[PDB]
């Protein structure tokens, strides 16, 4: 747009490196491009979690004989789902500002990773979101937690945990806030609580990757794999489709733009995934 | 159970202080509400009634039907006192159930002079008889949210 | 009730139900039994040994302890009256049975320590006290019988 | 029909219900019989070799007899009320059948004075209790025919 | 296509079939693969053991 | 030393087995899994084995 | 698999449990080195008893 | 009420002169203010939300936004007023809508209570160091939904 009834001509501002602009964003609360993804064609997805688990054995027999019980599991449904994102644009406003098409198409791409990201981490199984990553999890042991502990040992000791229920665990899932408290904290012995050095790290704790997601939560800390644990079935791809003939588009010059996905979301893991949370 | 007194009931609301037992007598203390077989999934997705009858799966969590829609209730009734107030649909999962034995009143919803079923979904569904049984003799208002004797 | 014709572990002699209610001298509500079918002289021998807890299921249908999910079978305090017949040879629960909600003696421990279930033997053999249906009683008994009462 | 009157045989001696039920239950269940027309049912429940205990078929309907009739096994104790005396009562009827249960009239053949017998086809005769039928010590009395009262 | 709560007709029945819908197994939390194993017939084994000694 | 201290001598292995004919499955319709093993087990010198008791 | 593993070495002997091992076994105790010192410290201390059989 | 002291059967906007009569400054009767009859797009919603950025259409004629972005121009935060539909209880058929310059009331939702502008991602918000200040005449009362206003 070149009208000037609101709109100034030092926001249309020509780019080629010279009266340069600057429309840069920041990435987080991603999960997505670490997660795998397959084809799948279906209506809906059927996964399965474990219960508590009754028994009809104990040791307590050795001539006494069986007993009723069930190993129970409980299923949960997801329906196809839509996930997408919407931007609306001005054709004449994109074309005069330079970078502003680019940047609407990069938008749009960050707005669909969180969407994605929100459904997938929170609330227990729902039909009308994409919930695993809370469910999943096991809840905080006490025993890790001591008077005075320090806030690195009970990341290393989080990790063992995980071990225990043989899953895949190679990385560590933290906010981005707890994290950098908890790197900041030095012994008064003058160690790196992480690991137990006097050198700049990129954040390793166990040996392992960080990966920053700020769906987790303050005082959140959750060892876990993202390919084991989740996986994506995909009935239709990525494809984005922009309509100029919809009903908003003719009302004044204007292009929308959709960019889009439906998916499907199964979870490969009963009970695999769990969490402590940091009382430091 | 196996009956059905209403007309408004024996006594008004979710509650009988003139009724107590009915088969076998009163239950102690009431249970958390756990969808699915008691689960560790705690809300969303089916079961829970919102002032139903209950099974319990597990010696100190209550829950409700799953296997079964639109066919009565195998094994275990358990009516609410208290929860006063709350027509029966959807889920109500995470909430404290104070339980005690048959013989106090529940909450209903569906059509008057009917027999009603329970649904794994957590709601109950009344009709004509084609595949709809159990309940005493008839007398259900056609306003949902009615005192059902069981 | 005979105490002392059981073996080792939590376990008593069958239990006959003569005391708080006694039929052959009075006629109530018969309804099926979905445990038993072996014992001669009124089967039952194998459906119940010292009469646990009897449930209605689908329609009028009573059985014993079984299942941990989906309808828990067993529970209440309504009892099923074995009458006066043989100990341990005339157990009615493999007939029509006739119930009420009182009665003694009821045995609800099987052997080794937890509230017992009722399997396709007529005895008990040992549930779990927090994942099965609990009517309110824990077991104190230790190893070798001693009474229980629900 | 619902009317409270015992049938579903030949009327003669007791039968009679003015109050419904003996477990404390005032029953009215309807259901259709998924048996359509085609009998001698036409007429009524009547004379020789009719119907009267009927067993659902594990829905909420109702039908003869699945079960094996030389093993016993758990049914599903209803009898159809008096639907009006002659006209259609029980199976064959290809409309909506109403059924009770709980210490009702029920239907045996043979004379035999008292000691009789469930033979799984949907009606109880005489016969040698051991696995079978008892609704005490003995249960109530068999004639060829006739409808009696528990 | 979009459900619109949590309540579905859905739930009951499959809408997917797939061998995987979770599951776990432990290797570690048996004695038994650790130590060797032999076959045996007999209702029992008999053994004579030592009894205590003070030694010296 | 799990190996050369104890053995295991197997009877019967384990073995899951699974019936759908009998009483309860006759009476209303009911599938069991069936799972069981018979065992015994040898002691080759076991005052090698070493009890402790954590404290902490 | 669990449950015979657990009755045969340890459990305690009662009139539906055996226990085989745990009687058997010779005494070691970690509290002679410290009582209360870390679950790390005891698995450690607790290698050396071994020794002493003539097993390393 | 449906007019006057509220406005209901309305899903874009609640309640609004509230006063009672007109007070607005260079006010006659009002003019369609759209986004139920359809504007001309409307800037953000980042969950179930119908307020966004609403753009003057030059003059005193006022609709949902009909330019890009979030830039500087004049005009006052007005009060927002909806006014009752002439269909059952959909959008569309609205009644000419006089905007009121302090009437009653919005809800609130930026940083202050009487203090509020309207920004690009929806609802009302606090300013930013950079552009804007905050500075409105939010009104009583809270609530965020597609319905709004109480």
Same mark, same amino acid.
Request: charge should be negative; charged fraction near 20%; hydrophobic fraction near 45%.
């Given at each position: 747009?070149?009208?000037?009834?609101?709109?100034?001509?030092?926001?249309?501002?020509?780019?080629?490196?010279?009266?340069?602009?600057?429309?840069?964003?920041?990435?987080?609360?991603?999960?997505?491009?670490?997660?795998?993804?397959?084809?799948?064609?279906?209506?809906? %997805?059927?996964?399965? /979690?474990? @219960?508590?688990?009754? !028994?009809? &054995?104990?040791?307590?027999?050795?001539?006494?004989? +069986? #007993?009723?019980?069930?190993?129970?599991?409980?299923?949960?449904?997801?329906?196809?789902?839509?996930?997408?994102?919407?931007?609306?644009?001005?054709?004449?406003?994109?074309?005069?500002?330079?970078?502003?098409?680019?940047?609407?198409?990069?938008?749009? %791409?960050?707005?669909? /990773?969180? @969407?994605?990201?929100? !459904?997938? &981490?929170?609330?227990?199984?729902?039909?009308?979101? +994409? #919930?695993?990553?809370?469910?999943?999890?096991?809840?905080?042991?006490?025993?890790?937690?001591?008077?005075?502990?320090?806030?690195?040992?009970?990341?290393?000791?989080?990790?063992?945990?995980?071990?225990?229920?043989?899953?895949?665990?190679?990385?560590?899932?933290?906010?981005? /806030?707890?994290?950098?408290?908890?790197?900041?904290?030095?012994?008064?012995?003058?160690?790196?609580?992480?690991?137990?050095?006097?050198?700049?790290?990129?954040?390793?704790?166990?040996?392992?990757?960080?990966?920053?997601?700020?769906?987790?939560?303050?005082?959140?800390?959750?060892?876990?794999?993202?390919?084991?644990?989740?996986?994506?079935?995909?009935?239709?791809?990525?494809?984005?489709?922009?309509?100029?003939?919809?009903?908003?588009?003719?009302?004044?010059?204007?292009?929308?733009?959709?960019?889009?996905?439906?998916?499907?979301?199964?979870?490969?893991?009963?009970?695999?995934?769990?969490?402590?949370?940091?009382?430091? | 159970?196996?009956?059905?007194?209403?007309?408004?009931?024996?006594?008004?609301?979710?509650?009988?202080?003139?009724?107590?037992?009915?088969?076998?007598?009163?239950?102690?203390?009431?249970?958390?509400?756990?969808?699915?077989?008691?689960?560790?999934?705690?809300?969303?997705?089916?079961?829970?009634?919102?002032?139903?009858?209950?099974?319990?799966?597990?010696?100190?969590?209550?829950?409700?039907?799953?296997?079964?829609?639109?066919?009565?209730?195998?094994?275990?009734?358990?009516?609410?006192?208290?929860?006063?107030?709350?027509?029966?649909?959807?889920?109500?999962?995470?909430?404290?159930?104070?339980?005690?034995?048959?013989?106090?009143?529940?909450?209903?919803?569906?059509?008057?002079?009917?027999?009603?079923?329970?649904?794994?979904?957590?709601?109950?569904?009344?009709?004509?008889?084609?595949?709809?049984?159990?309940?005493?003799?008839?007398?259900?208002?056609?306003?949902?949210?009615?005192?059902?004797?069981?």
């Amino acid at each position: 747009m070149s009208q000037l009834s609101n709109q100034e001509k030092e926001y249309l501002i020509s780019k080629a490196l010279e009266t340069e602009e600057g429309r840069v964003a920041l990435a987080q609360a991603m999960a997505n491009p670490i997660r795998v993804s397959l084809d799948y064609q279906g209506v809906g %997805r059927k996964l399965l /979690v474990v @219960d508590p688990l009754p !028994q009809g &054995a104990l040791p307590v027999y050795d001539k006494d004989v +069986d #007993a009723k019980a069930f190993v129970i599991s409980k299923r949960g449904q997801v329906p196809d789902q839509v996930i997408e994102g919407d931007r609306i644009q001005v054709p004449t406003f994109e074309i005069v500002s330079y970078p502003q098409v680019r940047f609407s198409q990069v938008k749009e %791409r960050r707005f669909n /990773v969180i @969407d994605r990201a929100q !459904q997938r &981490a929170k609330a227990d199984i729902m039909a009308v979101e +994409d #919930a695993e990553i809370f469910s999943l999890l096991e809840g905080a042991a006490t025993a890790v937690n001591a008077v005075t502990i320090s806030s690195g040992g009970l990341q290393r000791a989080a990790l063992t945990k995980a071990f225990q229920e043989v899953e895949k665990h190679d990385l560590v899932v933290t906010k981005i /806030v707890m994290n950098a408290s908890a790197f900041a904290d030095i012994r008064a012995w003058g160690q790196n609580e992480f690991d137990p050095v006097t050198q700049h790290e990129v954040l390793q704790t166990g040996l392992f990757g960080h990966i920053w997601t700020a769906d987790i939560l303050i005082s959140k800390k959750v060892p876990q794999n993202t390919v084991y644990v989740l996986a994506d079935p995909e009935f239709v791809g990525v494809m984005p489709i922009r309509q100029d003939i919809q009903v908003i588009p003719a009302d004044k010059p204007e292009e929308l733009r959709l960019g889009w996905v439906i998916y499907e979301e199964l979870g490969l893991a009963v009970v695999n995934s769990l969490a402590i949370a940091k009382i430091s | 159970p196996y009956v059905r007194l209403g007309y408004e009931g024996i006594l008004n609301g979710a509650h009988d202080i003139d009724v107590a037992g009915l088969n076998g007598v009163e239950q102690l203390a009431g249970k958390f509400a756990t969808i699915g077989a008691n689960g560790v999934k705690l809300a969303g997705d089916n079961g829970t009634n919102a002032v139903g009858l209950f099974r319990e799966d597990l010696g100190d969590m209550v829950n409700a039907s799953e296997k079964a829609s639109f066919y009565f209730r195998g094994g275990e009734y358990y009516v609410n006192i208290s929860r006063t107030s709350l027509t029966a649909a959807g889920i109500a999962a995470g909430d404290e159930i104070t339980c005690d034995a048959d013989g106090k009143m529940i909450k209903f919803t569906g059509t008057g002079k009917a027999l009603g079923v329970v649904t794994h979904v957590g709601e109950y569904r009344a009709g004509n008889m084609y595949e709809k049984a159990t309940q005493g003799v008839t007398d259900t208002d056609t306003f949902i949210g009615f005192i059902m004797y069981v």
